[PDB]
A paper describes a structure:
Omicron variant is characterized by significant mutation in its spike (S) protein, which is a major target of vaccines. In particular, the receptor-binding domain (RBD) of the spike protein has undergone more than 15 amino acid substitutions, altering both the transmissibility and its recognition by the immune system. Two bnAbs, L4.65 and L5.34, showed ultrapotent neutralizing activities (IC50 ≤ 10 ng/mL) against almost all the pseudoviruses tested. L4.65 and L5.34 were mapped to RBD-5 and RBD-2, respectively, the two major antigenic sites of bnAbs elicited by ZF2001.
To explore the molecular basis of their epitopes, we next determined the cryo-EM structures of these two bnAbs in complexed with S-trimer of prototype (resolution 2.65 Å), Omicron BA.2 (resolution 2.75 Å), and BA.4/5 (resolution 2.85 Å), respectively. The footprint of L5.34 locates at the typical RBD-2 site towards RBD peak, largely overlapping with the RBM, while the footprint of L4.65 is at the typical RBD-5 site beneath the mesa in the outer face of RBD. The epitopes of L5.34 harbor more mutations in Omicron BA.2 (D405N, K417N, S477N, T478K, E484A, Q493R, N501Y, and Y505H) and BA.4/5 (D405N, K417N, S477N, T478K, E484A, F486V, N501Y, and Y505H), compared with the epitopes of L4.65 (N440K and 498R) in both Omicron sub-variants. However, despite this reduction, the binding affinity (KD of 1.67E−10 M and 4.07E−10 M to bind BA.2 and BA.4/5, respectively) remains relatively high. The high affinity is still effective in efficiently preventing the viral infection.
Residue numbers in the entry:
A (entry chain A): 348 to 541
B (entry chain H): 1 to 231
C (entry chain M): 2 to 225
D (entry chain L): 1 to 215
E (entry chain N): 1 to 216
The structure:
Amino acid sequence: NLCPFDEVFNATRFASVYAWNRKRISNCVADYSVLYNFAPFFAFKCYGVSPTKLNDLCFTNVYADSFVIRGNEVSQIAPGQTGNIADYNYKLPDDFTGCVIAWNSNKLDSKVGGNYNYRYRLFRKSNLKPFERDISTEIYQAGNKPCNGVAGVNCYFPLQSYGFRPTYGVGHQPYRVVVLSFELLHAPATVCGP
Amino acid sequence: QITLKESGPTLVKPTQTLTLTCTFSGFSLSTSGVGVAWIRQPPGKALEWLALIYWDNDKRSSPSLNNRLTITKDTSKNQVVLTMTNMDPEDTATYYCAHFFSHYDSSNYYYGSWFDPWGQGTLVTVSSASTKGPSVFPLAPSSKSTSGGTAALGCLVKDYFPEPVTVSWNSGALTSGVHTFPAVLQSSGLYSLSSVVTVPSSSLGTQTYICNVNHKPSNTKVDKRVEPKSC
Amino acid sequence: VQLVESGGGLVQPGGSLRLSCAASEITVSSNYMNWVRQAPGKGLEWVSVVYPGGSTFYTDSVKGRFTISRDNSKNTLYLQMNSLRAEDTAVYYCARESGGFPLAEGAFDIWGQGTMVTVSSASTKGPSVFPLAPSSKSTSGGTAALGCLVKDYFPEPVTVSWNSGALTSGVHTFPAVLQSSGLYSLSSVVTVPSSSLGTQTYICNVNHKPSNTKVDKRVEPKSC
Amino acid sequence: EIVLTQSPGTLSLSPGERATLSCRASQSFDSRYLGWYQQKSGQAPRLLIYGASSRATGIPDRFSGSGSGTDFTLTISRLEPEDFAVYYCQQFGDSPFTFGQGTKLEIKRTVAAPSVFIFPPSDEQLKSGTASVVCLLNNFYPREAKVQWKVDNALQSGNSQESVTEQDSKDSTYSLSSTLTLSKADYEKHKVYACEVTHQGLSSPVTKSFNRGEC
Amino acid sequence: DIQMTQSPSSLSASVGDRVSITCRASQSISTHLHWYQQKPGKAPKLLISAASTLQSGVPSRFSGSGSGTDFTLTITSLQPEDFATYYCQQSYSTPRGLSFGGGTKVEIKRTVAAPSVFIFPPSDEQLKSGTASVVCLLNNFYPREAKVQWKVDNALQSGNSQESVTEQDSKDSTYSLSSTLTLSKADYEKHKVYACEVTHQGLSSPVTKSFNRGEC
Ligand SMILES: *[C@@H]1O[C@H](CO)[C@@H](O)[C@H](O)[C@H]1NC(C)=O
C-alpha cells in the first residue's frame, strides 16, 4: 500500500501558485527513497529533518502542495521569507517542518508561443496567513475611486500569467515545486517508512 | 519514421464550412512536446500557418483567422480535425498537416523546434461553379515547309472544373517535349490549359498525333486527333 | 495622480533627515511605493520599495541607514535617512510601481516632483562678485563680452541679473561647479557690441537667497 | 507581427559553386526560433535546419546555418543537381508563426532565344461562341520574358492569360503559353493577330503575326 | 547585477525624422524592459511598457520592439517637444535589482558655427587676497564637442581646470562654454603669459588666445 507520490511528482498538469494544489497523504506506507532517486531534482532541500531520516520515522497527516513558479522565486519558498509569492501566493510558516522539492520543468511547462496557463497573484492589501489560499479574482482597487468591477486605471486584475517560453534563462524558466508537510498530531501515526 | 495523411472534401462551396481529417502514424498525441500543426499554401504563394494543437489539448490559431477556425484531436483514433467556416474564394490552397516537435537535451535547453514530416497535402478549392468536361480545340502547326525541322503542335483543353486534367500524347509513345502548362483560373472561376508537343516538320503527315485528355470529376476521356491544317 | 514631496534640505555628513510623500487619488498603502534617487548630473538609481502588504526592500548602498514607512491615516509615504554620507546628495522621487492603464508591471507610471537632499559640511556662506572685462580693442568685429564671476557660496540656487533685469538678451549663465573646497562658483557672461561698451554702463546683481547676499557690482572695462 | 524577408528573390547557380540565402526579421528574437525548410517542385516542404544552426536528421553536411539578431543565413557549400528548390525561413518567436516568401534556386545555363509559335482556334471553337488563339514561347533562359498581343496591330491589355511551365529536367530552359480569348464580334472584326516578344536572349523584339482570312 | 547600456550616449536629430535608440542587457531579460522619458528639471515619464506596449496617453509616434538582450525605442516623427533624455529600465533581476540605463539625450541638429573665444584675466580686486581665477570663454559653438587647453609660456597647465557648459538654447540651438583655472597668488604671480588653445569641429585649425600678465 505505497503512498501515491508518483501521481504528485508525475502529474501532467500542475497548479498555478495562486491556486496551489493540496493533497492529503495518510494511511499509507511512504518510501521517500524514490523521491531522492530522481536524478534531476535541483532542490531536495529542508531544515528540520535530515534527508536520510525520512524513511526512519512515522508521521501522520502528511500534506503535499504542488505548483509552478519562476526559477528565481524558488528561494522564496522557505520559512521567514518575503517577496511576491511568499506574501501573496504561498506563505510558509516560520516553524515549518517538512520540506521542498523544486525541479526545472522547461520541457513540459513551456510553449514556443508562450504558455499562459500558469498564473500568480500580484495585488493584495494584506499578507497571506501561513498555508492560506486565495482564489478571489476581484478587480483590485489601488485607489480611492471605486470602479465597481471594471478594470482600468487604479483598478487591475489581481492575477498575472507567467509567459513561460523555452528560450528563457534559468531564473525565469518554469519550475515545479512540491512542498511536503509532516504535521505531527496526537493521533495514531499513519504515514510510516519501510 | 512517421507518416501523416489528410482527407476530406476537396470541393467546398463558398460561404460554407469544411472539415479536414489528418490521420497520423508513427507517433501518438500523448508524448510531451508533440503537436499537430495545420499549414496552408495558396497556389503560387508562400506558406501560411493556420493552427497548432498540442498533446495537452492546448490549441493556438492565427489571430487573423482564429474567429472561424476550430481544431480538435482524437488520440484514440490518432486523428486531428480542422473545421474552417465562412469560406471565401481566396481560401483555395493546399493544406498540410505536419508533425511539430522540439529538441531539449538533458537540461531543458531548447535547441530549437521544427515542423517535421508534413502530410502529402490536400488541394482544397472554394468556388461556386460545378463540374464541367473540358472542351478540346486542336492547335495546328503553322504553314511552314522545313524551318530546320522545328515545329510544335498541341490541343487546348478549356472550360473545365475542377482540377486536374491529365493529358497523354500518343498513349506514352510521344512524350519527347510534351509541355503541359499549369492550368490557369479563368475569369469565371474555371480552368483552361494547353498541352503541346515539340515535333519536327519532317514528320508532319507520317507521325500520328493524339491527346488523350482525362478528367475523373467529370469522367471526361477524350482522345482528340491533332492533324496538320493547311490554308 | 498627484504625489507632493517635502522634507529636503542640506545636512552635515552623519546627520539624518525625513522625506514625506503625500499622495492623492491613490492609496499609498495599497500600492507598491518606491523611492528613487538621481544624483545631480548622473542617472536614476532605485533606492527603496515598500509592498502593499508592508514588505520592504532596499538597495545595497543604503542598507541599514535608510528606512521606509507609511502613514495610512493621511496616506503618506516616509523615508527616514540616517548616518547620511556625501554620496547621498541627490533628488529623491516618490514613484508608484506596477500601475498604468495597460498595467505596466515592474514599471513606475506615476512620479512625484522630488526633493533635493545635500550632504556636505560646506558651512553656508556668501558669494563674492568679480567683474570680467574684454580685451582693450576698438571693434574687433563688433564683439565684446563682459562677465560676472560668482564665487565661494553654498548652497544652490543663486540669482544673477544684469542691470537688475534691464538686459536679458545674450546673457549666458553657466551651471555652478562644485569646487574641491566644497564651495560653488559660476560665471554669467554676456556679449555686447564694443560701441555700446562706453555708452551703456553695466552692473551685475547677485542675489544669493540662503545667505541673504544682495550684491550689485559695477561692470566697466579697465585701463591697461 | 514578425515579418521575415528573404533575399534574393530569385537565385541561379550551376552545380558545384556556393549558395547563400539571407533572411531578415522585422523584430528581434532568439536565434533558436528560426528554421529553414526546403520544398521541391510539387512536393511537401521538408525540414532542413532548426534553431538556425542545427542541421536536421539525415540532411547532408552541405547545408549550414548562421544566425545573429535579425540576420540569418543559409549556406550550401556543395550544391548538387538535385538541390534546386524553394527555401523558406520561418520563426517560432511570436504568434502567429510566419514563413518567409521563399527563394527559388535555379539551374544556370547559357542564354537561349525562345521559339515563338502561334496556333489559331479550331472550327469547334469557332462554333462555341468564344475563340482563343495561343502564342507559345519555348526554350529560353532566363525566366524573364515579355509578350504583347496585337489585334490589327493594336495593343491588347487585360484580355489575355499567361502560363509559364517549370524548369525542364534535361535542358533547364523555360516554356510559356499565353492565350488571347475573344468573341466572334472581335475575331471577325479584324484581320491581323500578332505577338511581339521581348526577351533577354533577343537583341530586338520580334513581331510575328497571322491573318485568319488568308489561311 | 544586470548591466544595462544605451546606444548612443547622445544623438542629434532633426524634426520629423525617424530615430532609433538601442538598449542592451548583459544577459537575456525576456521582455522585462521599460522606456522612460525625462525632460530637464522634471520627473521621468513612462513611455513604453514591457518593451513593446505603448502606454495610455502616450502619442503613437513612440514605439518599442526587441526582446532578450537587445531592445529598441523608435520615434517616427520627432516633434519639437520630443527632445528629452530617454532611459531604459529592467525589472528582471530581483526586487533589489531594478537598475536603470545610462540615458540617451536627443537635441536639435543645426549647422556648425565658430565660437567667439575670449580670455579674461585675474582682476586686481580678486588678486588682492591671493585667489586668482582666469577664464577662457567660448561663445555660440555647435556641436557640443570641443577641446580646451591651457598654456603658460609654452608650458601646459593641466589637472586644475573647471568646465561649465550651457545646454542648447531655444533661440539659436548653440552651446556656450567656460573653462576656469583657480590658483593662489604666487601660483600665477611669478609666471608671465597665459593663453588658451581651443579646438572645434567648425574650426579648421585650433586657435590660441594669449594675454600678458605684464601688459594687463
Ligand atoms: C512518470 O510517468 C512516466 C510516464 O507515465 C513514466 O515513464 C515514469 O516511469 C514515471 N515516473 C516514475 C518514477 O515511475
